[PDB]
Symmetry: D2
Subunit: 333 residues, 4 copies
């Protein structure tokens, strides 16, 4: 594997692959590309303000990072086609930059000689978007450029998939109360894209924000195609998010009935977990699920024949999503 | 006018009454010196542009004396302590306005929704919660125009003084209220939806909802997801609700794509935000999302003071 | 057949002390915790032990009963007696020794209550006056004797400053010093501006959105830990908007003319194999020390010597996890104090 | 009227615009940045630190409109190609981009036809560094490119100047407990310059950080050249900072004596204020002083003949420093 973008997702992908050890023996990272010195990349891998200090020996050379006696070549090629990692025997590209979020853009990795590309984000409606343990089965040996979806997609998908299987979703709306991310502003100022809300200080604001996670969920769950919409509120934490789903269902239900039906689909599920301890956002930081169902927030509102059903799942939008991406990575082998 | 509880709401009530009626005395659990200091210097709302000092038994603002008591039992009124949230408790205090929900056995007033149910016989009145003053007008005018069959609310809400600075024992013993407010999204109860029946009787039993407490000092928004009687578009929802904001000092309007800190210091109980309106349709099934911002401190406080002035 | 601990105050320090004793396992075998006292339900105490916003989720089986907390099949009786003298844990649970972590018994006279309830010994998780021993493990744990009944583990700042000042003074001689600790907010601070116990104008202010100047006795009282520095240091804190992780800056006039390299090499040698006084030259920031087991971590990258002829100021800096770092120091002092 | 072009409509640039607007025979006529006028108008109107501008703010395709007055917005990354002198009559450029932090770079504004340039940062040793009400008197009619120093320089300079005047500073060290700034990272990641500490999430860290404010204070107070060093701790608030100074003085002093001596130099001083109410960082947000002396934190440590003196001053590193720069801009008109 070649990692393009050794950012939050790229470095956590590296940590996840490393900590899996033998359960990841079928893959091996060999090289990294970013816009930065190997010295700083080694430093950021080692010391993480959100996830703590890597329990491993981390150093840098003029052109690489060294972890536990193993050399990882670092390039600084802004153009994906000019990365010569295919010098390192790269077969697949983990595309984590946010600048190649297209079949047409990620084509560059296939030009540099990659077999396959997995993009760490939504990447259009014209390729497969995989949420592991929802639709990883649509993957075939012909697939060259695949989206691992967004963090919100990996949280919403299993909640919606199993809720719809059990009760039938006619229509739903989503709000994700979502940790701030690296595209946001530390202080009010000019932001790429020019968005009036993305421009605002992330740490001291609730910021309404677009996600396609609901609108595009059709790519992951065809039966929900065109049935969901939603948006995010970016709030003042570094990591840890929850998705609220409000839906009209086919079936009349109670909260207990919704919770027992969804919970059964979490039994032994490493992608879609369960928690009824009344956790809060920081409790999911470092968890390995893409989605954690929280029955304690389930709410069914009924007046005669009209019924609204609220369900909620937590997610570590960094490490939780990353563990989903790595599961999807391993399946590509 | 006696302010019981010179806290966030009590001190902002004092600032609001001053900047506009007159306060004559204050009760809390603290020295006059600290109360004068907290009135003067406010981490959320800035420095009071007035001369503030203390004596051994009072606060002085612009040459005017405001007597300070430290009596825990009110049996020794703007009730802002959070410890007298009942007709029975507030009995201790001509009239009492409680700065919070206070049960189903007295009137709960959201100014510019139901302040007209007030009569000269009313002695103990609830000004409702901050969330009630935000939700009420959004639900009232949305229901008037389109008919709400059923709705759920989520308020993305600033942390408040009942929450914990760091994980620890909290009064009430709630597992979530116990957790560090500044570094958590914390699911949290509000009665604002379930009890909205007290303010808007026809929405009784039609709404539920809850809060997510998030890591800002002040400034909140309410999301309402509803099944309506009428098929609508976002533009149609926004134009219909917006007309009810024209000249409305309690229910304002903003389409500039603001964020939470922009409402800090605003005088509305509720600010409709058309930019977040969302209609989801598959055949005959339709969900409508509407959103209103609120300064849960100063916005709610300006609502309480409007309700206070109507008592004269 | 070991010394049985009652924890009074299952707060930040109390719960982390419990986690530290648990994770030490056999290295803590000559201690065992049997009982807890606080102002709350066992259900909430078990919840707070399990889920920690700063230090993460306890890798253990945690539950509650009507009157206790259960960790890994082991029962820990929970009382809710606000008066230390009325905690029946001596007769009920066999408590030898009280770990006093409430902040409300921060005196020989107040902590006397535990000796009245029948405890042999009390270790206070804070400064507790100038009339009992204040121990910083690996500076002065040697002044402990079997006669000692009520002992202070010092403050977090004391456990950070003490070794930095002790070894700096040993190598160069401190004539005079001032300290500033840039310190995480703590549970005594306010979430939003308002009335605070003690009435302090600064402690009253919203902790998350302010730099708040604040008293520490850590410098003034450092004499209790290091007699030769007695009356030579003063200092104060700036409380800043993080949940945990602090650093102490020491500015001193030394006997010796020095360079930064010379100060760093001399102090560093006293960190070799030192479980209490660690070393880090990776250019870390506050969050990097959250969960570290040192009371103090020397940071040579911040060392600064300012010279104009014969006038010289030396700035040295050490990080500390004011929660878990200090707690690991308190537990080291606990394991010695009980085994005396 | 004094006619101003703002280059860089960032934190400092937008606050400079607010300050000049609220003031006095000074007027902004044009703005240059790398963004839409729509977003610039939005950020001027709504400020997460300083609140909502009490004025009517709108945008056109090429300008910002405030209270029926048009302010042309350019998007020229090269200072020499900003046509604001011929188009808008710009006299003085307020350089607030961070990318022209040199006599040689800011020369570009003089090439585009500007009379003078004031740079909102340290800008080297080969032009004057002015802290208003310390050394604004060294300005002459020949000075065309001037540094306003840093926020920390405007806080430290008066504290050190008046402390040294009264007692003589032999040697000092500074720590500024400083709000996070726009160069810092919202989350751990690659940062320009590659600094291991500047790379770290600003909102959840105390981050040790360089300032030249002490080492280069020689530019403002020549006699303290080589006598001071120091550094910053970047902490998790949006704005509001304090400078601690620890010094060996010529004179034996008490805290009361230090406080009375320094306080005298704050009387009527619009640049170097006084506050003994036991304030905290947020209380200085929106204040107009470059420095606010806080006697409550004064500390003298003595053993025999060895004495350390700790003094402290607060500063709104945004609006306080900005009010200092606008003061230096108005003095430019008297030249
Ligand atoms: N952070 C999350 O919660 C999260 C989770 C799921 C999806 N994602 C997606 O993953 C991607 C990465 O986001 P992130 O949070 O890691 O951001 P980040 O800014 O931390 O990571 C981006 C990294 O890519 C590097 N980079 C940028 N342009 C490059 C180029 N042209 N060539 C090489 N390297 C380049 C940057 O220097 C940086 O290190 C985005 O597409 C994002 O939407 C993020
Ligand atoms: N802050 C908000 O967003 C908001 C908005 C609407 C309503 N409210 C309600 O207003 C009330 C006050 O909340 P707040 O945010 O001002 O909190 P706060 O804690 O700052 O104010 C409460 C004040 O009352 C004092 N007090 C406590 N017990 C007392 C007693 N027995 N006698 C006298 N004084 C006593 C406290 O010392 C404190 O000064 C609560 O009911 C709250 O639910 C809060
Ligand atoms: N937090 C730090 O960084 C730190 C570091 C070292 C020292 N300390 C000291 O440790 C002590 C505790 O501080 P903390 O941060 O753990 O605070 P905390 O508020 O989290 O813990 C105090 C606990 O004691 C309980 N309590 C209070 N009064 C009680 C009583 N009368 N009886 C029983 N339980 C009672 C409270 O309910 C709470 O659970 C203080 O003396 C503090 O100064 C704190
Ligand atoms: N923020 C503070 O506390 C503070 C205080 C004193 C000094 N300063 C200095 O002020 C300057 C600006 O700092 P800031 O915090 O306002 O930063 P900022 O990022 O908020 O502002 C910089 C602005 O300049 C614009 N810009 C960048 N390059 C440009 C170019 N070539 N042409 C035109 N516009 C360009 C950017 O779009 C942005 O709007 C820096 O030199 C900084 O060191 C900052």
């Amino acid at each position: 594997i070649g990692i393009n973008g050794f950012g939050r997702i790229g470095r956590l992908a590296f940590r996840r692959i490393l900590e899996l050890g033998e359960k990841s023996s079928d893959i091996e990272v060999v090289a990294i590309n970013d816009l930065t010195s190997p010295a700083l990349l080694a430093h950021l891998l080692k010391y993480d303000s959100t996830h703590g200090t890597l329990n491993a020996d981390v150093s840098a050379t003029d052109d690489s990072i060294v972890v536990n006696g193993k050399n990882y070549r670092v390039y600084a090629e802004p153009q994906a086609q000019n990365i010569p990692w295919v010098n390192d025997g790269v077969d697949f590209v983990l595309e984590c930059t946010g600048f190649y979020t297209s079949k047409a853009k990620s084509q560059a990795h296939l030009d540099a000689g990659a077999k396959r590309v997995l993009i760490s984000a939504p990447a259009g409606s014209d390729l497969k978007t995989i949420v592991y343990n929802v639709n990883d089965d649509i993957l075939t040996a012909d697939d060259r450029i695949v989206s691992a979806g967004s963090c919100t997609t990996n949280c919403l998908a299993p909640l919606a998939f199993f809720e719809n299987k059990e009760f039938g979703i006619k229509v739903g709306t989503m709000t994700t109360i979502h940790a701030y991310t690296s595209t946001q502003m530390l202080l009010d100022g000019p932001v790429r894209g020019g968005n009036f809300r993305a421009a605002r200080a992330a740490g001291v604001n609730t910021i309404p924000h677009s996600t396609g996670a609901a609108k595009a969920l059709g790519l992951v769950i065809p039966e929900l195609n065109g049935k969901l919409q939603g948006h995010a509120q970016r709030v003042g934490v570094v990591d840890g998010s929850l998705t609220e789903l409000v839906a009209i269902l086919d079936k009349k239900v109670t909260a207990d009935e919704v919770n027992a039906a969804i919970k059964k689909h979490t039994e032994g599920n490493e992608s879609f977990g369960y928690n009824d301890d009344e956790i809060v956002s920081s409790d999911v930081i470092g968890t390995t699920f893409g989605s954690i169902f929280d029955p304690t927030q389930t709410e069914v509102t009924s007046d005669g024949d009209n019924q609204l059903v609220k369900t909620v799942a937590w997610y570590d939008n960094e490490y939780g999503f990353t563990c989903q991406m790595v599961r999807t990575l391993l399946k590509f082998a």
